[PDB]
Design a protein around this ligand. Structure first.
Ligand SMILES: CCCCCCCCO[C@H]1O[C@H](CS(=O)(=O)O)[C@@H](O)[C@H](O)[C@H]1O
Length: 377
């Protein structure tokens, strides 16, 4: 018997299946913020205070180092992660302890209006330069002041960390020992600024969060969108203007660079302060199972944590492009692994937001970012 509390901020469907096979166990969803940094700030407060209310925590792929070192989670003792994609086995392992079980993979893709590219004879762009030239050509034809060339995240949210690193990684650089490439940091901030200055992105991109990009593209207002796999279900759902009008490509590269992307995804941890440790673990073993991974791929376009589900016939029937997504996820670059990740994120996202709001130049942004990261890495 148990009333379990899960922090998830279609999962209700998965929880109803567990309840239907587990008599005397009911599960209630709890929330605290939309974007991941908001969820982190909240969980820091209640975990710091040893709050026993939550049993299971849905945590971002960037969280296990913090949660492990603070002793905020109950480790899966003797657990083998070898069935999961190795990138997620590694992320959920800290000094040899299994901190959490993978919930779903994720990576950033380029969503595009394949109807608009097709009308203008344009191929999916492989460089930001090709994306600019495509946007200009489509915008000149459409004469549509509501049509944005490129939606990307400029709000001071976790997503803007990812935004900063896409061009940095593309140029072949790494952040981590801190290894700050100033030229590539300014080049990243200049690129995102250049879309606002050129009109290819809207004047207030600094106000745009992950799900703003999702809603605006879904409403038919965006040619090109940087986003995560979950967007797909919404694009092809009942309140979309873009059903059957969406292509998915690897992100453009910077001139002469690689088509790199950011690793994302989430995992289920058990709270160290949970009073229902045994039933919490059993719920997490169900939620991290292959059957539930498959259900979440088909019903919510969450990329699987199991390699085999990428080319499972029921998964590809629903989302054909998942068959091409496995190597993108497998090769995706990771945000720095550190217990102090919240300080890394805070520095990077506020610098991106400031540059895009015009509050600081890319040059001053990069300098201030490097000074702040030095005290943290
Ligand atoms: C039914 C459940 C749907 C939720 C699936 C996507 C959640 C957002 O997660 C993605 O974006 C984060 C940035 S942000 O949007 O929080 O700024 C990244 O950190 C994550 O790694 C990535 O998976």
């Amino acid at each position: 018997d148990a009333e379990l509390k899960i922090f998830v901020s279609i999962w209700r469907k998965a929880l109803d299946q567990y309840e239907a096979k587990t008599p005397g166990v009911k599960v209630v969803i709890e929330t605290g913020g939309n974007t991941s940094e908001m969820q982190a700030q909240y969980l820091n407060t209640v975990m710091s205070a040893k709050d026993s209310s939550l049993d299971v925590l849905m945590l971002d792929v960037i969280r296990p180092a913090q949660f492990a070192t603070a002793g905020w989670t109950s480790d899966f003792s003797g657990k083998d992660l070898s069935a999961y994609l190795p990138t997620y086995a590694e992320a959920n392992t800290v000094n040899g302890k299994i901190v959490a079980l993978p919930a779903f993979a994720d990576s950033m893709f380029l969503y595009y209006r394949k109807d608009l590219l097709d009308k203008y004879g344009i191929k999916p762009p492989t460089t930001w330069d090709e994306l600019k030239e495509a946007s200009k050509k489509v915008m000149e034809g459409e004469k549509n002041p509501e049509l944005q060339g490129l939606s990307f995240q400029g709000k001071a949210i976790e997503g803007a960390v990812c935004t900063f690193l896409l061009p940095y990684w593309s140029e072949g650089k790494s952040l981590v020992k801190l290894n700050f490439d100033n030229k590539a940091a300014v080049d990243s901030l200049k690129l995102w600024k250049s879309f606002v200055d050129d009109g290819i992105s809207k004047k207030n991109i600094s106000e745009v969060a992950t799900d703003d990009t999702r809603k605006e593209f879904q409403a038919g207002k965006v040619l090109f969108a940087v986003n995560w796999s979950y967007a797909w279900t919404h694009f092809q759902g009942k309140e979309s203007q873009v059903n059957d009008k969406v292509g998915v490509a690897r992100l453009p590269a910077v001139k002469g660079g690689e088509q790199t992307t950011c690793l994302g995804g989430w995992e289920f941890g058990v709270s160290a302060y949970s009073k229902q440790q045994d039933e919490a673990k059993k719920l997490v073993e169900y939620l991290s199972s292959q059957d539930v991974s498959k259900f979440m791929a088909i019903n919510a376009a969450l990329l699987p944590t199991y390699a085999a589900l990428y080319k499972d016939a029921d998964v590809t029937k629903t989302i054909p492009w998942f068959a091409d997504a496995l190597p993108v996820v497998e090769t995706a670059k990771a945000r720095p692994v550190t217990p102090r990740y919240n300080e890394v994120s805070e520095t990077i996202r506020t610098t991106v937001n400031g540059v895009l709001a015009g509050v600081m130049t890319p040059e001053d942004g990069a300098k201030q970012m490097e000074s702040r990261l030095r005290r943290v890495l």
